[PDB]
Design a protein around this ligand. Structure first.
Ligand SMILES: CCCCCCCCCCCCCC(=O)SCCNC(=O)CCNC(=O)[C@H](O)C(C)(C)COP(=O)(O)OP(=O)(O)OC[C@H]1O[C@@H](n2cnc3c(N)ncnc32)[C@H](O)[C@@H]1OP(=O)(O)O
Ligand SMILES: N[C@@H](CC(=O)N1C[C@H](CO)[C@@H](c2ccc(Cl)c(NC(=O)Cc3ccc(F)cc3)c2)C1)Cc1ccc(Cl)cc1
Ligand SMILES: [Mg+2]
Length: 411
């Protein structure tokens, strides 16, 4: 049933998953010197390419591939349109490895046909808490704790094959070549998400959406006027009233983050992310890169009380192409990113997020039910979307966890 994934070091069924009790590697330990030094052989009409993310033309090529061929909704009404500035930010964090960005071009005209990207992440991925309690019952705490240390691994994203080349087994070729480049740098695990079911996720969660401009969302059919709103003499006036927001944040210590906040935001975020079984560890350079405001890309605000940062939130921007509306070309979406609340309830912190996003002209705020994102769904008028986001590891055995134990945001 899975000619490619059946050959790979991942759990093969949910039943195999069920019997996983400790974190650890799936495969034979291997060494760097065992891995072939040359790229995988490929069809003579194609060539492997390592883009230069410092070259505008190279970023543009990836931008165009994704604009026309990346993820769509179910009914082909929307397609993500990551910007060039966003791609530079997502693909080039501190100490990124250029060779982890793998592409296939057509030899004759250098047209970009397929891409996959790997970036470094330092991840805690040791045995989850509920299994550590089970281990204590069995007298097995040391084996359960063996891989507690954060690990330097690969996060894989942006896998894309051009529409004209779909169903020709090119995606396995990409994933094998990515794996070889990552293994040649002595890294043997990867983490990735997908909106489809593959062998075999360790967590799964619903998407959630908070309308900010309901009149536009209904014009472009992202939203409907829900059936209950018809019994009303006037639907859209009532929908706008339901989702109205104040003009300005309610917390008077809220301001944009600046470079001098980096140490305090690192500390409050790392103390919060400790709570979770799987989550990133960030240096000051990584907090600077992923959280300092960047025009059109990432937006971050801190609550400062008595010259101390006590809370913060961040959200990032991804517009989507609206396929065939005469009125609107683009959905302007905000996505909840990292945050930490120490001084006020989380719902009060995130209400300020919605206020800021709305004032900045975003149409919708979206998120997955990781972190403590459930705690504020109902009070802040989020609704569940369609399908689920699935979280996976490569070459890592891991017990199933709830998505409220996951703290890694994937862009
Ligand atoms: C240590 C380092 C390890 C590094 C690597 C870690 C693993 C990284 C793995 C990648 C994580 C990506 C994270 C993200 O970016 S998820 C976002 C994926 N991108 C899109 O959805 C964009 C639009 N769609 C496409 O571009 C194509 O449909 C893709 C490229 C998805 C498949 O192209 P195509 O439709 O032309 O198919 P094929 O004939 O070439 O190949 C069919 C085989 O591919 C398996 N397939 C289908 N979809 C996915 C998917 N999303 N992850 C993994 N495998 C997938 C499928 O089950 C089948 O295998 P098998 O069932 O026969 O066995
Ligand atoms: N490797 C993953 C990365 C990922 O997990 N994402 C990337 C995506 C944007 O940051 C995020 C996400 C977070 C929260 C929500 Cl509500 C949605 N979904 C939507 O925005 C709806 C939507 C679906 C398709 C569209 F073409 C446009 C909008 C998507 C989840 C690839 C992927 C991309 C997009 C999706 Cl929907 C699912 C998976
Ligand atoms: Mg293919």
């Amino acid at each position: 049933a899975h000619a490619f994934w059946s050959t790979q070091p991942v759990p093969q069924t949910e039943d195999e998953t069920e019997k996983i009790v400790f974190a650890g590697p799936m495969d034979e330990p291997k060494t760097v010197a065992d891995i072939p030094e040359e790229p995988y052989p490929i069809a003579s009409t194609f060539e492997w390419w390592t883009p230069n993310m410092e070259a505008a033309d190279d970023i543009h090529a990836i931008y165009e591939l994704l604009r026309d061929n990346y993820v769509e909704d179910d009914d082909s009404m929307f397609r993500f349109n990551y910007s060039e500035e966003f791609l530079q930010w997502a693909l080039c964090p501190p100490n990124y490895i250029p060779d982890w960005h793998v592409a296939v071009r057509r030899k004759a005209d250098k047209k970009l046909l397929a891409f996959i990207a790997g970036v470094p992440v330092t991840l805690r991925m040791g045995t989850p808490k509920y299994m550590k309690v089970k281990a204590q019952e069995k007298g097995e705490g040391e084996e359960a704790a063996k891989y507690d240390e954060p690990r330097h691994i690969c996060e894989i994203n942006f896998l894309c094959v051009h529409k004209q080349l779909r169903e020709k087994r090119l995606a396995p070729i990409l994933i094998k070549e990515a794996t070889r480049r990552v293994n040649r740098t002595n890294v043997w695990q990867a983490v990735y998400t997908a909106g489809v079911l593959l062998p075999t996720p360790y967590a799964s969660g619903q998407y959630f959406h908070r309308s900010l401009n309901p009149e536009k969302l209904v014009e472009i059919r992202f939203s409907g006027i829900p059936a209950q709103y018809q019994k009303f003499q006037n639907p859209m006036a009532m929908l706008k009233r339901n989702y109205q927001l104040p003009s300005a944040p309610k917390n008077s210590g809220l301001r944009e983050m600046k470079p001098s906040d980096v140490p305090q935001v690192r500390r409050i975020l790392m103390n919060y992310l400790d709570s979770f079984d799987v989550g990133p560890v960030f240096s000051d350079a990584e907090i600077s890169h992923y959280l300092l405001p960047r025009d059109g890309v990432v937006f971050t605000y801190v609550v400062e009380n008595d010259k101390k940062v006590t809370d913060f939130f961040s959200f990032y921007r991804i517009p989507s192409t609206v396929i065939g509306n005469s009125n609107y070309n683009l959905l302007n979406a905000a996505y909840v990113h990292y945050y930490a609340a120490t001084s006020i309830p989380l719902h009060q912190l995130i209400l300020d997020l919605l206020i800021v996003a709305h004032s900045r002209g975003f149409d919708v705020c979206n998120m997955v039910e990781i972190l403590d994102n459930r705690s504020f769904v109902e009070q802040l008028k989020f609704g569940a979307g369609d399908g689920h986001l699935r979280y996976y590891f490569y070459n890592w055995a891991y017990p199933k966890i709830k998505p409220s134990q996951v703290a890694l945001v994937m862009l």
